Design a protein around this ligand. Sequence first.
Ligand code: AJP
Ligand code: ZK1
Ligand code: ZK1
Ligand code: ZK1
Lengths: 29, 378, 279, 105, 111
Amino acid sequence: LSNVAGVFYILVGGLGLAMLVALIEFCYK
Amino acid sequence: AFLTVERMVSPIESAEDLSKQTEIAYGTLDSGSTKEFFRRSKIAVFDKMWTYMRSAEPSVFVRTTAEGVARVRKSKGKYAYLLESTMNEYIEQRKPCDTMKVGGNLDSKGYGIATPKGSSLGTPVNLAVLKLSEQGVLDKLKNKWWYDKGECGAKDSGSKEKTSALSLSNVAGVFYILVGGLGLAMLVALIEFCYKSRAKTSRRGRALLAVALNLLALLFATTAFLTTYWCQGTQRVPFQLRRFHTGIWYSCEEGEKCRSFIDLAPASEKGVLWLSVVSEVLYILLLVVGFSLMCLELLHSSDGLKLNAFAAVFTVLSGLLGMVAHMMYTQVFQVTVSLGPEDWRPHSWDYGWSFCLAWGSFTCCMAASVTTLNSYTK
Amino acid sequence: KPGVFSFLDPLAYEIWMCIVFAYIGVSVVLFLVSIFNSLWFSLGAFMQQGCDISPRSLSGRIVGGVWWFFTLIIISSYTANLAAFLTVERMVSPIESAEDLSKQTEIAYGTLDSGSTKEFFRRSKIAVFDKMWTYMRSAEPSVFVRTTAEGVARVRKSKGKYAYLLESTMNEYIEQRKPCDTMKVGGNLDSKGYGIATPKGSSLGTPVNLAVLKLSEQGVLDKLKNKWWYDKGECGAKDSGSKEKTSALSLSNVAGVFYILVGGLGLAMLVALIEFCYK
Amino acid sequence: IFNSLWFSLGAFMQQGCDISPRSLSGRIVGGVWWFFTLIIISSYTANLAAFLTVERMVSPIESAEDLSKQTEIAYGTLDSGSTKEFFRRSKIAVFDKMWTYMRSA
Amino acid sequence: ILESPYVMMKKNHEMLEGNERYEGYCVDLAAEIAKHCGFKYKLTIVGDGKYGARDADTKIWNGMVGELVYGKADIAIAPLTITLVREEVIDFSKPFMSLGISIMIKKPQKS
Ligand SMILES: C[C@H]1CC[C@]2(OC1)O[C@H]1[C@H](O)[C@@H]3[C@H]4CC[C@@H]5C[C@H](O[C@H]6O[C@@H](CO)[C@H](O[C@H]7O[C@@H](CO)[C@H](O)[C@@H](O[C@H]8OC[C@H](O)[C@@H](O)[C@@H]8O)[C@@H]7O[C@H]7O[C@@H](CO)[C@H](O)[C@@H](O[C@H]8O[C@@H](CO)[C@H](O)[C@@H](O)[C@@H]8O)[C@@H]7O)[C@@H](O)[C@@H]6O)[C@@H](O)C[C@@]5(C)[C@@H]4CC[C@@]3(C)[C@@H]1[C@@H]2C
Ligand SMILES: O=c1[nH]c2cc(C(F)(F)F)c(N3CCOCC3)cc2n(CP(=O)(O)O)c1=O
Ligand SMILES: O=c1[nH]c2cc(C(F)(F)F)c(N3CCOCC3)cc2n(CP(=O)(O)O)c1=O
Ligand SMILES: O=c1[nH]c2cc(C(F)(F)F)c(N3CCOCC3)cc2n(CP(=O)(O)O)c1=O
């Protein structure tokens, strides 16, 4: 499961990086 | 990797394999010429087998022949046994027939008719052996007393298919979720034929349920915050029996006793555990932030959905850090088993009972979310 | 030589039928959304090629999802079983016992044209050995060879579809001799023994008979059997058993899918021309 | 002829195409070649899996007992010298089998 | 010696008498030697249950060999392994059944 676990941090880290994008584009509108 | 190694493994045939492998044990009777044969033999294969069997702990030497029959049957193939081939024919014929004879003979021995020395009968009896062996009447009686007396087949030994392909039964556990998904869907179609047919309590009563599911999501969060016992930790030595009932943090052992044993080795795994506590607390704190903004909706039930849109952010960010936290502990709990948990390893290794519960806390965080964005449509 | 039926190895023949049986059971459900159309929309959910009818969020979304989930399992499992056949490659022998020779008729079998072995089948009363002798007396062309080395070459030249019956200790030794393209299968058909003979009434006869029971007891005979069959054997068995490290794909394996490729085309050309007359 | 050349690339391996010959003979033509191409590629995967595994399954030999075990890689000494004399003289069964091979080489 | 399938007891051995009470592979062989050599026969089970080993202390053969050497028995039709030290006191015939040590393992399971 540690083999998959290295893809979890790019899974969750891609989500939290996207939440920065959605909130600023609410201010770019 | 499964089907190859499954087909890479050959069944052993010769006894040179037993000098080559060590996983399947093998023995003889505890007294007899067969045990004496390996004790006497100078061939290096037979000598190595005797070197193994004199060093075999626990003892491969059985006391009766039927004990050697059952010890093969009970060990499930990882114990072999060495016996006389004609008897090995007959016991393979006797039910349950779960044993079998493999390979050729290790040596040559012969049963022969004996007379007292100097008897007059000795010479025509010796001629009678060369008469009956010539005519195959002995082999006819061998067909009689091993195969007309044999319970499992006479030719049915050759009915076991050798190296055939993947079974249909391998694909049968997915049939019940195939057909079961169909019959569950037929319930959905017939009731939605009546939901098209029977037709502020819509957006409010579903939003209050989203608050109500978060309340259960809080309680199962506190439930696995102290697990009653995470695993039935079994070290049942036939020493004596051991039953650890270790929670999520306190490692209780059980007559009744309980200890902490929190924060084991190693240090890199400790920083994972220090990070594990962070994802536990951020799970519960962002619930409380989600409770407070929904209590503003209760003041709005006495902005609005704009703060409920902000409340739906942190409740998802709660449960995802719980999905971190559920993977922080069990990977570590898998890591601690890889350490050999110092004296408290489980052999009934099985997650218990609040970890299935705090699973449902996450889906209550998300079932609250799917209906509070349903009220966001208005 | 592979071919048509041999492409179908990694998935069993019962599984070939049941994958098509449960296939048509799914397509009747999507007909209630919009039996006649969804038979091809079940081919839209067969492996790939995402179909155009989308039962958006009702029960057909579940029916359209599970069979789609079901089929992505198999093609992984078919690939994994295929990699098992393409890597392990245990060439199994067709036959073991002589009862198979009473059961099959494709691989011929014979003895020497004169000897006790031919006499044995001529004399035997066991129905398996009698049927083999019934075959060999009716074997045209004659399976009976004139020399033993003729029986060696006739097995070698017929390429496995001719067997031969000979003495097991000699069958050990010839299998050791190169080209080593023959092998011994199965156990003995009977019990025969080589034994030291003396003239009758000789004084040497008794301690020589005791000498046999001494050397067989000590395994020096078996040590010389290891000497004169395996220290003299040219093809060392496990040294020759571990020799295959070969490579890339055949073409007869793919060729079995060509006949269902072209045969599906010519069957479709019948359908198009008659539907030009159904219009 | 003009459009379906790329819609044959829509049925090449993946990328389900937009023209759907719904339930006529083109559904059969669109299905069989699509069925034909998934064969080639699954077998291409299993062949390459048979390559890289056996390539990594092969260990380089380190002991001379491997030379008594294998026969594909030959091995010899100088035609005269104590080293050739050593295998000629040795009583260890591994070294004796190597000399048995080299005198039969 | 009572060994399956060489010498066995009947289910109705009380309903039978003498040689009829016994059955097995060596029992049918005992009929064939009588058909060959022309004699009446008495199948007797060995008392101690031994195959006829030699003592190392008294150097007295027990078992069937002790019944054969000491005049107690007339002949043996039994699974008796032909060894060197057994021929030193009695006379075997030619072997009717070659055998050797074999490997009994479990059969591959159908699970
Ligand atoms: C509680 C127990 C514990 C142990 C114990 O203490 C208490 O110690 C034991 C000890 O061990 C005792 C044994 C010692 C050894 C004894 C041996 C004896 O037999 C001996 O003598 C013959 C029988 O008396 C045997 O052979 C006879 O039977 C056939 C065996 O196959 C022969 O073939 C036949 O010879 C021929 O006879 C004539 C015809 O041609 C045919 O019928 C036959 O082919 C023989 O029958 C007799 O044959 C006559 C001609 O040979 C003689 O009468 C004599 O043969 C020779 O006998 C010689 C003996 O000295 C003698 O010198 C010589 O002149 C004789 O010609 C023999 O009787 C022969 O094989 C053997 O040697 C046996 O019956 C009894 C015996 C086992 C004893 C029984 C009791 C014990 C076990 C004692 C007892 C358990
Ligand atoms: O002459 C001999 N004949 C034997 C014949 C048989 C049987 F198979 F029943 F016929 C057996 N059995 C097989 C396993 O042990 C229990 C019974 C043992 C025999 N032994 C003992 P050994 O000293 O272990 O060889 C002999 O000596
Ligand atoms: O006593 C006998 N001993 C025998 C020994 C052997 C050998 F194996 F070579 F030792 C052979 N061969 C079998 C292999 O091919 C060459 C000859 C025949 C023998 N025969 C003839 P049979 O009448 O056919 O049995 C005997 O009679
Ligand atoms: O005392 C000895 N010292 C040796 C030293 C060497 C060198 F390596 F060059 F130092 C060599 N070589 C290696 C191969 O052969 C050509 C030169 C041979 C030697 N030999 C001959 P051997 O009989 O084959 O052992 C001796 O006898």
